[PDB]
Write an enzyme that holds these catalytic residues in place. Structure first.
Site, PDB file in Angstrom:
ATOM      1  N   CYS A   1       5.631  77.735  94.288  1.00  0.00           N
ATOM      2  CA  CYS A   1       7.083  77.667  94.194  1.00  0.00           C
ATOM      3  C   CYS A   1       7.655  78.759  93.306  1.00  0.00           C
ATOM      4  O   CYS A   1       7.198  78.966  92.182  1.00  0.00           O
ATOM      5  CB  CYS A   1       7.504  76.310  93.643  1.00  0.00           C
ATOM      6  SG  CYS A   1       7.091  74.954  94.721  1.00  0.00           S
ATOM      7  N   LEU A   2       8.668  79.446  93.818  1.00  0.00           N
ATOM      8  CA  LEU A   2       9.314  80.520  93.076  1.00  0.00           C
ATOM      9  C   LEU A   2      10.726  80.663  93.630  1.00  0.00           C
ATOM     10  O   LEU A   2      10.941  80.532  94.834  1.00  0.00           O
ATOM     11  CB  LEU A   2       8.526  81.821  93.266  1.00  0.00           C
ATOM     12  CG  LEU A   2       8.500  82.842  92.137  1.00  0.00           C
ATOM     13  CD1 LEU A   2       7.891  82.226  90.882  1.00  0.00           C
ATOM     14  CD2 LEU A   2       7.686  84.055  92.575  1.00  0.00           C
TER      15      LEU A   2
END
Lengths: 157, 157
Positions: free
Chosen positions: B93-94
């Site tokens: 996740c980013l």
């Protein structure tokens, strides 16, 4: 008289009591405990009717106990996925798939308060539960009483 | 109808081959017929020196959708890594990897890979993707780092 399916479809305190004195056994018997997602669903539906009233409190607590004992006691049941999906459905942990987080956490928190004090409860899950109940979240802040109670209980695990 | 994505990816490949950070790997997979599959890349990110991730080479797959670059690529560590922002499935996740967040058609593979590398030792504790790593990070930092070092040594080239 009532049946488990109708109750789970549209949960209410009265419908749970209408299941009869063996309601706890029926809930667990009619739930596919081999599927974590279905156990999370049943756990949340039953806990959603929790009321701080004698008969209802007892009925919800006994149902949770029968359901979770059956699920947890299966050497094949993945307790970690149950916890993760529970947190996801409670809106405390994000997920890749889209889920509809329940609007009221009062019942789920009170049900958990009871569950964590039972012998069938995997103590290894306590730290994870504690981490996400203490973590800031609007849904938890609106259920301060239930939340503080659960946390105080988790401290004693 | 992925001709636009393929045009961009062909250029991303030439750019990367022309110049990229040392230690990093990003190469398109092959189709059964031997041709290049620009929609599925096998990458590797080296742990940042000076951090407990040093010495490790973390492999991940980058999958592009037919509507790329309107949408970001999906990045999954293989195997899944112990990290607060990595799903149990391996998905990382980013913000720059979320269409409704910071993803912009122009973002490059190099930026993504460097972004993920930076994320390794600088997790976003406010929005965890897994309960396990988050809990440990918050309850026992020394233990968390110990697990991170063990994982880095385990994935040493």
């Amino acid at each position: 008289p009532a049946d488990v399916s109708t109750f789970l479809a549209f949960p209410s305190p009265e419908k749970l009591l209408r299941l009869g004195p063996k309601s706890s056994v029926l809930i667990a018997q009619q739930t596919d405990t081999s599927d974590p997602e279905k156990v999370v669903s049943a756990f949340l539906k039953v806990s959603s009717v929790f009321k701080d009233e004698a008969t209802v409190r007892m009925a919800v607590q006994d149902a949770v106990d029968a359901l979770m004992q059956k699920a947890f006691n299966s050497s094949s049941f993945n307790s970690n996925t149950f916890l993760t999906r529970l947190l996801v459905h409670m809106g405390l942990l994000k997920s890749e798939d889209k889920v509809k987080a329940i609007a009221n956490l009062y019942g789920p928190l009170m049900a958990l308060n009871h569950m964590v004090q039972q012998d069938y409860f995997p103590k290894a899950l306590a730290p994870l539960l504690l981490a996400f109940v203490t973590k800031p979240n609007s849904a938890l802040e609106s259920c301060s009483f239930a939340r503080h109670s659960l946390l105080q209980t988790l401290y004693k695990v | 109808m992925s001709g636009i994505a393929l045009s961009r990816l062909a250029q991303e490949r030439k750019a990367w081959r022309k110049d990229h950070p040392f230690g990093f790997v990003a190469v398109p997979t092959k189709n059964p017929d031997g041709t290049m599959n620009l929609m599925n890349w096998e990458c590797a990110i080296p742990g940042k020196k000076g951090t407990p991730w040093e010495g490790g080479l973390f492999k991940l797959r980058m999958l592009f959708k037919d509507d790329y670059p309107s949408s970001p690529p999906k990045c999954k560590f293989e195997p899944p890594l112990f990290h607060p922002n990595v799903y149990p499935s391996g998905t990382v996740c980013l913000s720059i990897l979320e269409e409704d967040k910071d993803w912009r058609p122009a973002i490059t593979i190099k930026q993504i890979l460097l972004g993920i590398q930076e994320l390794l030792n600088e997790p976003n504790i406010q929005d965890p993707a897994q309960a396990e790593a988050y809990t440990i990070y918050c309850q026992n930092r020394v233990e968390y780092e110990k697990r991170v070092r063990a994982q880095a040594k385990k994935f040493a080239p």
